[PDB]
Amino acid sequence: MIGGQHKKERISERLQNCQNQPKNRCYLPGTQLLTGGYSTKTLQGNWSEERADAGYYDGKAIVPTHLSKIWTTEYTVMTNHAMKRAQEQAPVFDQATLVDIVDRNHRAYPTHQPHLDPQLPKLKEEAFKTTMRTSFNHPQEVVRPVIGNTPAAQARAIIMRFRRQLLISMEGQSAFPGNVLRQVRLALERNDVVGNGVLNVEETFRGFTEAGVETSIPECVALVRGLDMKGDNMLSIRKVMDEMRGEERDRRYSIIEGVYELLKKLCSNGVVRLHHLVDLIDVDSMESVLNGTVSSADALRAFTTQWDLPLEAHISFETFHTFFRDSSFEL
Amino acid sequence: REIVCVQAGQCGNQIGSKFWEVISDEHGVDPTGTYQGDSDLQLERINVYFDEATGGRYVPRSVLIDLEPGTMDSVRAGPYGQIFRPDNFIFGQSGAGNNWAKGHYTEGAELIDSVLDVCCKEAESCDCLQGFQICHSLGGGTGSGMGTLLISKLREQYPDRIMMTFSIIPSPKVSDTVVEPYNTTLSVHQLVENSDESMCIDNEALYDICFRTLKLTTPTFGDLNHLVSAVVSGVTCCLRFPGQLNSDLRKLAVNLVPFPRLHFFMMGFAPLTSRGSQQYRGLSVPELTQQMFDAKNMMQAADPRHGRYLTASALFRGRMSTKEVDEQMLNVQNKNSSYFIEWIPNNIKSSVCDIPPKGLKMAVTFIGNNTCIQEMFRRVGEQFTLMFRRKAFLHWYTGEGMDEMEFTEAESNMNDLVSEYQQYQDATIE
Amino acid sequence: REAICIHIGQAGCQVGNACWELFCLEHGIQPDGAMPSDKTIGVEDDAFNTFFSETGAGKHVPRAVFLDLEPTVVDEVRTGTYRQLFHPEQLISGKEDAANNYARGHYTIGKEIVDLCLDRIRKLADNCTGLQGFLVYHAVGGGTGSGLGALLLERLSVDYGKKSKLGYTVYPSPQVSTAVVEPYNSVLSTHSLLEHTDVAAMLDNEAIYDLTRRNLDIERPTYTNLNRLIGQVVSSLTASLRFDGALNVDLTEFQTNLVPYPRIHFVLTSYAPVISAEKAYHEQLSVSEISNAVFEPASMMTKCDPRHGKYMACCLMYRGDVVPKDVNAAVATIKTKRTIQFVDWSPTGFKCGINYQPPTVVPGGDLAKVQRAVCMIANSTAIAEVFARIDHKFDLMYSKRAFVHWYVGEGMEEGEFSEAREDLAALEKDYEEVGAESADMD
Amino acid sequence: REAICIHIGQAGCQVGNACWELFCLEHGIQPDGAMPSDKTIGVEDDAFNTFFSETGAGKHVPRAVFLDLEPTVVDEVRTGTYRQLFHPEQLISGKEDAANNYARGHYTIGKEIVDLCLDRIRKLADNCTGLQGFLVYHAVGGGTGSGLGALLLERLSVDYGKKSKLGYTVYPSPQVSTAVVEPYNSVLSTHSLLEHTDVAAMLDNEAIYDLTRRNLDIERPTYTNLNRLIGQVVSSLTASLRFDGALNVDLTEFQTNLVPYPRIHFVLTSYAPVISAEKAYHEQLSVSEISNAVFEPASMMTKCDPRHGKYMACCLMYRGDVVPKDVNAAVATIKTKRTIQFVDWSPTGFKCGINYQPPTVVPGGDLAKVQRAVCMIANSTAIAEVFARIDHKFDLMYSKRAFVHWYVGEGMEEGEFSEAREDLAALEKDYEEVGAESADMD
Ligand SMILES: Nc1nc2c(ncn2[C@@H]2O[C@H](COP(=O)(O)OP(=O)(O)OP(=O)(O)O)[C@@H](O)[C@H]2O)c(=O)[nH]1
Ligand SMILES: Nc1nc2c(ncn2[C@@H]2O[C@H](COP(=O)(O)OP(=O)(O)OP(=O)(O)O)[C@@H](O)[C@H]2O)c(=O)[nH]1
Ligand SMILES: Nc1nc2c(ncn2[C@@H]2O[C@H](COP(=O)(O)OP(=O)(O)O)[C@@H](O)[C@H]2O)c(=O)[nH]1
Ligand SMILES: [Mg+2]
Numbered sequence A: 001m002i003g004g005q006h007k008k009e010r011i012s013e014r015l016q017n018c019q020n021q022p023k024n025r026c027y028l029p030g031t032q033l034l035t036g037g038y039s040t041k042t043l044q045g046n047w048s049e050e051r052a053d054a055g056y057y058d059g060k061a062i063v064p065t066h067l068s069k070i071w072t073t074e075y076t077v078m079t080n081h082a083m084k085r086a087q088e089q090a091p092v093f094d095q096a097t098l099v100d101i102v103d104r105n106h107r108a109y110p111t112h113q114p115h116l117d118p119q120l121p122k123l124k125e126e127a128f129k130t131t132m133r134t135s136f137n138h139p140q141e142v143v144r145p146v147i148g149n150t151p152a153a154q155a156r157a158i159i160m161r162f163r164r165q166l167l168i169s170m171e172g173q174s175a176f177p178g179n180v181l182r183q184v185r186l187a188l189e190r191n192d193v194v195g196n197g198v199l200n201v202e203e204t205f206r207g208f209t210e211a212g213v214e215t216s217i218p219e220c221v222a223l224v225r226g227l228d229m230k231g232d233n234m235l236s237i238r239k240v241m242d243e244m245r246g247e248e249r250d251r252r253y254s255i256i257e258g259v260y261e262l263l264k265k266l267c268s269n270g271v272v273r274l275h276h277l278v279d280l281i282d283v284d285s286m287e288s289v290l291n292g293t294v295s296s297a298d299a300l301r302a303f304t305t306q307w308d309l310p311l312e313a314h315i316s317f318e319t320f321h322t323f324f325r326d327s328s329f330e331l
Numbered sequence B: 001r002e003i004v005c006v007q008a009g010q011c012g013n014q015i016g017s018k019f020w021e022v023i024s025d026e027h028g029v030d031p032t033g034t035y036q037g038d039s040d041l042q043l044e045r046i047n048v049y050f051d052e053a054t055g056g057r058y059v060p061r062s063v064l065i066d067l068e069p070g071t072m073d074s075v076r077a078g079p080y081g082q083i084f085r086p087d088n089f090i091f092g093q094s095g096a097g098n099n100w101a102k103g104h105y106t107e108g109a110e111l112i113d114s115v116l117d118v119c120c121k122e123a124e125s126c127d128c129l130q131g132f133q134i135c136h137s138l139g140g141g142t143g144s145g146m147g148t149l150l151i152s153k154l155r156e157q158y159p160d161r162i163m164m165t166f167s168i169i170p171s172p173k174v175s176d177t178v179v180e181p182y183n184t185t186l187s188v189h190q191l192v193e194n195s196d197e198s199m200c201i202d203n204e205a206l207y208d209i210c211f212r213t214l215k216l217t218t219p220t221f222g223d224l225n226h227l228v229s230a231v232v233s234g235v236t237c238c239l240r241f242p243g244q245l246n247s248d249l250r251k252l253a254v255n256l257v258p259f260p261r262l263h264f265f266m267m268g269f270a271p272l273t274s275r276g277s278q279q280y281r282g283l284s285v286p287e288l289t290q291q292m293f294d295a296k297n298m299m300q301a302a303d304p305r306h307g308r309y310l311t312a313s314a315l316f317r318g319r320m321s322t323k324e325v326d327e328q329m330l331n332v333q334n335k336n337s338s339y340f341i342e343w344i345p346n347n348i349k350s351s352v353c354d355i356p357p358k359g360l361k362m363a364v365t366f367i368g369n370n371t372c373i374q375e376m377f378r379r380v381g382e383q384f385t386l387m388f389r390r391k392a393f394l395h396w397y398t399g400e401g402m403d404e405m406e407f408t409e410a411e412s413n414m415n416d417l418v419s420e421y422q423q424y425q426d427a428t429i430e
Numbered sequence C, D: 001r002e003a004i005c006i007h008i009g010q011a012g013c014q015v016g017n018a019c020w021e022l023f024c025l026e027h028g029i030q031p032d033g034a035m036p037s038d039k040t041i042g043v044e045d046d047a048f049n050t051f052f053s054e055t056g057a058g059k060h061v062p063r064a065v066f067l068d069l070e071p072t073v074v075d076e077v078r079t080g081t082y083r084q085l086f087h088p089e090q091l092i093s094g095k096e097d098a099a100n101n102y103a104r105g106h107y108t109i110g111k112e113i114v115d116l117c118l119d120r121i122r123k124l125a126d127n128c129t130g131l132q133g134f135l136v137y138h139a140v141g142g143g144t145g146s147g148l149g150a151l152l153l154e155r156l157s158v159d160y161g162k163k164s165k166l167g168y169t170v171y172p173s174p175q176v177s178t179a180v181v182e183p184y185n186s187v188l189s190t191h192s193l194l195e196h197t198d199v200a201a202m203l204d205n206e207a208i209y210d211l212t213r214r215n216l217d218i219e220r221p222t223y224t225n226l227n228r229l230i231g232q233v234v235s236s237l238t239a240s241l242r243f244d245g246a247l248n249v250d251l252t253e254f255q256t257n258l259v260p261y262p263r264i265h266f267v268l269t270s271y272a273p274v275i276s277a278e279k280a281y282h283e284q285l286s287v288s289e290i291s292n293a294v295f296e297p298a299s300m301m302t303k304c305d306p307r308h309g310k311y312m313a314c315c316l317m318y319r320g321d322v323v324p325k326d327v328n329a330a331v332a333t334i335k336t337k338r339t340i341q342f343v344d345w346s347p348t349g350f351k352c353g354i355n356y357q358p359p360t361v362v363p364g365g366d367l368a369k370v371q372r373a374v375c376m377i378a379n380s381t382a383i384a385e386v387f388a389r390i391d392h393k394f395d396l397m398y399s400k401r402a403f404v405h406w407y408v409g410e411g412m413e414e415g416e417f418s419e420a421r422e423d424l425a426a427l428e429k430d431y432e433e434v435g436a437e438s439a440d441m442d
């Protein structure tokens, strides 16, 4: 730790007038941890293992000197870029834990260093578990492969997981099919702050959490990196929604295009508007209304609202196509 | 099923202090003696090593004996020393003088009755008593003489229980005392008659463990005694925790000893790795088994590669599959088939315990019955024959009162032990 | 109607946990012993009675004892999840183990425990009105299972007499091994078991490990998997008592059809649709496919190859959606095969059973859900190979009197080794004579 | 699916530093062996396995050993930034250098260190399940690279046998030179490499200096630039194992396609879009331009002119956005050219590979970012001119025994010089005979 302060004499040692070798702590004058006749600063003997100690400290001041800058090795110049990033994080202990480390209290063998083991807390929670208690609990209480390190692979896997979660959940089911993806898209749009239709990692996380999907920050980092095509870590809402709809089969496309071509010929100048669709639809023929579980007026009202357009808006083929890909997601 | 511990002499008291630190840590006992653990699984077998004091406290079932109180004052001053019961410390007023005859005959018979009284008071308190465990050095004075005296008396008084010993034996390279061969020879003669199971440790082997495997720059006796405390506390783990295949000291003896004189065993403990390397290699059953059979990791100077295994036992701690254990033991037996005695169809017993030591995912302790134990005794007998022909220091022992005939009997008995191991080494089906 | 289960030692108690888990989940008893009251049930039902009895308050309690000499495993059962299901008297535990010594269990220590066990079994047998046998689970490799199992079977055989005793023993695997002294304990167990058992189902661990590696996709199996497979087998065998079916099979019919001579009661086992959930949706599982499966040695739960011997009798139990005509077509196809051979004195080699209840699926389990299953128990001379190898290992050790001082010191005569070894030699000759085709007749 | 890297001496370790920098940055492993949380989410992948193995805690550690007789370069690795990436046992260092003496490395000093190296490689190779070759980096001009590289390759070749060994070797350039004794060491090295290597790639520093002056605009290059170019070449050759592609090329296919006779295994290497950022934005870089580029001698990384010989085989690796039809059209256009000639016994002269992963960009690097690249290794008789010049320099020095007393003092017979010189003379005659324009029918 900085400045030592755990290699120094303790008050109990001073009061008891303790000597050196019973505990072999080199702090008294004239005694020092000599490896090969020299200090650990010199590369002789067992310096590598002594430098691997949990309580090791090197006397390097944080404020640097001039000759360190002047005297550099070619290897240091080659590998300095990674060193600057690698020096950001390091484990730290308080003083009581350092006292425990120096006194080497709880160890299976003399060289066992449990404080340097990153899996210690899960070991502690995992301790004192018996085979039967794990294997004989209460019986009531108890994926397409994707290959490659490419970010596109990660994005595809995450998209598939999200789609499966939405199918099993099915929030916001309406009287007319096609409201799940609409709710997800609206939730994403609501958390945009700028107005240009792009999102970053944190807003993507908040939006997908509001939409009902359980995620984490690394998931959103991977997704935004995978779906990025212009190098700015911005996520386009249109692109992600198009990927959430998925690949479309041929029969559904054929029916959609046939219905659109039929509707085109019944209008003037081949321009179709939304009130045409509202007037011409035959809502009382669905299986959900003839069986007797959804009223016809409610179904028509649900259909009219899902377009998110005024009654005089021009409905192109793109809007019709997108609307009925959204609806096919539930059938 | 309760064990009673006896700690004798300087080495025994020092090893005991580290052992009782390890046991108190594993069961979450504070150095004040208060239970502070975090699972009920710790409490249901606390009786095995601890006695119950009234409010919070637990007290450890151990007898401390020494001829000069210097060690007792050192152990009472240690970090866990307060836990020990005051009435369990028995001491005299003058040292053993590194002399077997003094320790056995003059101050031994004077003190031994008060020790037997304490051991009986401790023994009769158990609801069911398991074997005794003894720690002592063979090279010393009070450890060898009074320890073997006490062992003989307890074997007279409790012949149906188990007798287990951990014993320190003189290194081949540097002596700490000039008269080591006499004390060692007399003690091995007493042990081979009296003991049920005996473990032997060379300090040189612990130094080689530390330097080659752990790469310690400046090891101390605390490290050696920590390794020893680790194996001793490991052998009993299946006695005191649940597991898929429970085991017991008597079950170990039944599987390890083919004939009643062949009860001297080698020890090892597997997860050992240097502070720099531990981040680089995960624990797994192949790694533990390969280190476990490497002679570098065995705690005696004789190496298995010059002998053959009659029998071995491995106790595994942790949650792991049984198939991997069984197939590893089969693969080691099949690939190295010349090193296993052929008239026994399967030499390895396995046992599995769910709860590893804290901060390790898995561990195994290994007990081995190998004919290479004959090499240590032969070397000690050589040094004895060089000293005895010239009566090099014999007047001390004769002045205490010993007959020279004891030395010739003890030499003959050790030579017969070496011969019996050598004959089974070179035995054949015919 | 009723059956009493006796569980001995470590393997028997751990297998008991899986068995009672299955019987609870199949009948629907909760871990606290109370069935879900629901709204109502239209007609009154009784199938549980084979394994459970109800109190006047409607709690269920099971007809079993757990016997051990060491406390740890039974105390583990006592502290587990099923604490309230078992009656506390049923869980019997001693102070100290038999330390892999048959002699300690039989002579010294089990003699103290047997009278408590016999008093509990008597109290169970008094609370029955159509008891039709004992089922026993134990391992012969350990000390208490062999010694106390033999002593208790002897006492049961004197007190109860003619009542049947069916054992599901776990014998030592042919190259996987766990303890050094296994041959002595298995020989001495088998000597007592020869006189005092009606049908011995023999199981090995190496076969169930192979089965879980090959068919299921488990690289690192553990005993809970093996015990769940054994539990499935036991549920299949006892289903004939408990549910409606086309062709029921009472436990006395197994002994009548499967056992030709009173010593020839060692049998082999095999279970067909061991399959994982991912494999299960790519394949149909028709009657003829699972019937073809049960005769391959890759399906067996014991380590022996039946192509090196001759079958004497087979009993085939089908449960689930099966029609008798498909069973008949399958058996006729098996009969056509040239690598399956029957001794010429057994022309009508097969017994069939057909039950409507499909196998239950356990929440943590590894088997898939399937509409039909078949289970086989069969008597074959290939079981001689299992003994000859144990006896050879015994001869190897006994030539040097290996470890013998433990057995003689704890109270057993040296003579006891030679009698048992000669009895197993006679068992080898029984399998030689029974397997002989014909003599020199005119 | 796996490869093990062995780095020897100064050039091989310094080139290794650039290689492992690149492989880390390409996969995304941090300098401390970890991998960030977003690379390991959503998909589960194995491509690292060719070069890294993971511990059970998820740390990555690389499959390499570093061998040197002097401490300084390995101590630079031990104290640098990548300290935590490498396992400390893998970094092996001796006490003192081989002092430009082949004899000191091979006979006296390497004999002490070689058994540790073999033990580390064995411990690595046992923890593998699809090892598919050894990659070796060394220079033949220095003492330890020649002597210890030969000794280690001999031992590896006896112990591992048939497994392939591919070497990247820096030979002495035809007029830039750094030490006097280079001809002796290069001849003696080449004698060992003939028997114990499957393909040998030849490099000259003078060519990479020319390439860095001509294509890039760097007047004053240093070893880090050359080592980064070499690292790019190695990444191009090993990319076929690690990423998806249209036409994969396994490391055994290189050896099958490139080597016509067992001695004729020395290949030339070149790389196409070495280009600066200012030129890169002035030009399109279609497939046909880079295919035409790889055949110009200004693109080569070895100082030889291929116009003085005939090609026997070429292997062209395309990585990035390329479609096979343009590769076919390009190869047909190359085949049309009159200054490119193939031996008449090799009619089907080309092997192609196409991989989708584009080349990675290193933060301090000098290459531009480009959508596609091609790398070529080719076998040609022109290589015989390099050996003839080495032999002339050897003959000049050896006629007067100019330095031989050092070699004789460190343990070598004078005879070994003449043996090696006669073997390399036979290699020259092999390249004369194999290259024969035509044989007569009579
Ligand atoms: N299949 C299976 N085998 C088991 C199980 N438990 C133990 N075994 C095997 O049975 C043998 C050990 O027998 P044990 O039941 O432990 O012996 P024991 O009855 O406890 O006898 P003692 O040790 O004297 O108490 C070994 O071969 C084990 O592999 C189990 O749950 N399932
Ligand atoms: N491309 C490149 N060439 C190098 C590098 N280091 C040395 N060389 C060249 O390789 C030759 C020297 O070989 P060395 O590697 O120094 O010899 P060595 O392996 O250290 O052998 P010893 O001197 O005995 O230790 C000279 O031609 C150098 O120009 C390097 O880092 N990159
Ligand atoms: N391993 C170990 N050996 C010890 C320790 N203390 C003393 N010894 C050794 O034991 C021998 C001395 O025996 P000692 O205990 O003094 O005999 P005593 O005088 O009868 O108590 C010497 O070989 C010492 O090296 C210890 O703490 N650990
Ligand atoms: Mg038991």
Ligand SMILES: [Mg+2]
Pocket (backbone or CB within 6 Å): D009, D010, D070, D097, D142, D144
């Ligand atoms: Mg050098």
